[PDB]
Nucleic acid binder design. Structure first.
Ligand SMILES: [Ca+2]
Ligand SMILES: [Ca+2]
Ligand code: NA
Lengths: 161, 163
DNA sequence: GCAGAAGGTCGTGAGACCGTTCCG
DNA sequence: CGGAACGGTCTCACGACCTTCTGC
């Protein structure tokens, strides 16, 4: 149901007030790999503009979580997970300009995830993509993400790899 | 030569990192009315991303002015004036959402401008709209623009208007 | 005499995560 | 569980003008 100019407008707005990011969440309750990869895209806007986010929510099939207020007078719409992202990103990729690379990296992670879930070596290759995505969202002179270096170290220390 | 999805993308990017505004520029060298209504739409982005603005610039027929650095590590692309905006806005209005009204108000000012030039009373009506566009760019709790009130008082004390 | 190009900047509105709780 | 939804927030990257230099 997503028409071309709708996907295009959204990619434009996403390249503007939005974000495409990936991160590593520590999970104590997990087993061999005490980490969960989170992937997401989000739109941020001052709360009085909430309806506009709502509109994008409907155009995207009502996937995601909306917040009238994050707690600081700002509203957002966050779409987390491969389930939602595997459907949405393909529609926005052809129009994404500034954050096009980040989007393609999420997609790659989604591709690799199933087989990386419980394979230390694979999980690492997947974490390196998380670093790249995070680094793409930084200025050149900022300290680069180092999740791969830290996890490789941990995995060795734990005799997992 | 602007394609629909190109225009839609631009409208979305403009709604995000862009700005559509109007203002009054005092002009010491003007005749009857010493003010100029400056109209514009602009895109802003961090320095290192300047080439993305360049792309939009090319897509909008190279109209407007680019700045690799405003002076604070931020780059921008500003499209100023009726000539350029009367051509570009009509192309983006179909897809603008957040700043749609600001866009239609600039368009309205462009329609009225010709006859408001050397006409104090009409120039004020026009300035009322300049305040509206400016108010549309504020939070509801902020102090509204006062271009109309101050200009009227000036016109009155200058003998340019009688009521 | 008129106006677009180019300069400058304060007050945020965003971005890009990190944290904690819920749930089928 | 293995996400899914809810919370929270530092650090800027914007926005939306205002000011001044150019050009004819
Ligand atoms: Ca931005
Ligand atoms: Ca914005
Ligand atoms: Na923005």
């Amino acid at each position: 149901t997503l028409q071309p100019t709708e996907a295009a407008y959204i990619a434009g707005f996403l390249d503007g007030d939005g974000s495409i990011y990936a991160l590593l969440i520590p999970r104590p309750d997990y087993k061999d790999i005490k980490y969960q990869v989170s992937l997401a895209i989000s739109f941020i806007q001052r709360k009085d503009k909430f309806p506009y986010l709502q509109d994008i929510y409907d155009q995207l099939g009502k996937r995601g979580n909306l917040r009238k207020d994050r707690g600081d007078g700002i509203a957002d719409y966050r779409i987390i997970g491969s389930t939602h992202l595997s459907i949405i990103l393909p529609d926005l990729v052809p129009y994404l300009r500034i954050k096009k690379k980040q989007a393609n990296r999420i997609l790659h992670i989604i591709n690799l995830y199933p087989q990386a879930q419980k394979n230390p070596s694979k999980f690492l290759d997947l974490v390196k993509i998380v670093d790249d995505v995070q680094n793409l969202n930084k200025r050149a002179d900022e300290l680069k993400s180092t999740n791969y270096d830290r996890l490789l170290e941990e995995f060795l220390k734990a005799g997992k790899i």
